[PDB]
Amino acid sequence: QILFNDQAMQCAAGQTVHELLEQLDQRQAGAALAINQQIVPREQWAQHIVQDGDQILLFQVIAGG
């Protein structure tokens, strides 16, 4: 049980951020992610374990101006 993009959904314990994004089929290019309102650097996704109650955000970079 976590919040993904402000919406509840069920997951699987002991899974990495990478594992989760892979199952959801989400593009990770041009994407950044936060857990409990703090950015999780991309280089840490392979190892970072998602915890129960985690509030996750996955969004795209905007470069326009």
Binding site: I39, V40, P41, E43, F59, V61, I62, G64, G65
Partner: protein, 234 residues
Amino acid sequence: MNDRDFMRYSRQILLDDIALDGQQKLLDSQVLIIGLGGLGTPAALYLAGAGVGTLVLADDDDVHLSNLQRQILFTTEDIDRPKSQVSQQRLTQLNPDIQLTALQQRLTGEALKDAVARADVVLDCTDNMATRQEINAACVALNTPLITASAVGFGGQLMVLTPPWEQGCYRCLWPAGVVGPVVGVMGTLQALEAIKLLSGIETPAGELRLFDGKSSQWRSLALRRASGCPVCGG
């Protein structure tokens, strides 16, 4: 400061957080604004009105009709003229008492480095990642704070990055049309952050602020430095 500056800046001098010493600090400062489009034009207008001593305006594009929907510093008679020159001219009419320097070019390499060196704060108002990564690299290397924002469609993003880069840099975070007031709100907020940083007003930095202009909501996320960052990781 002289009588003319006192009257001109009176409405912010009345604020105890800025006052006479804070205004003098703005007058002694130098801001580099890279990109004079949707983000840069409102930012330059507010910074010139606020009394930033010297504004360096960098852009190598000419004014085009389709620009007018969001680049509020320009007019139909400016079409086909160089943006940095038109900006310099219009901003002078708003405030003829500060220094306005126009750079008609794509600031890169050595030239980018000398301009970031001379600036007290840099505003990244460009429109593509390669350029934003190059400006971020120059700011960290030259230890100069960077205020970066972006917008597309109804969305905007903004972050204030400052030495000692405790929350990382642009590269730690990032390894159709646009509605005029959405990019405009982002550029104006860049100006607000610069005024606070130059006048010494305590405020947060190191946070990514996201704006959804359609749901009309904002969210703040704490940035985090990436240990492997080729720019600010050591």
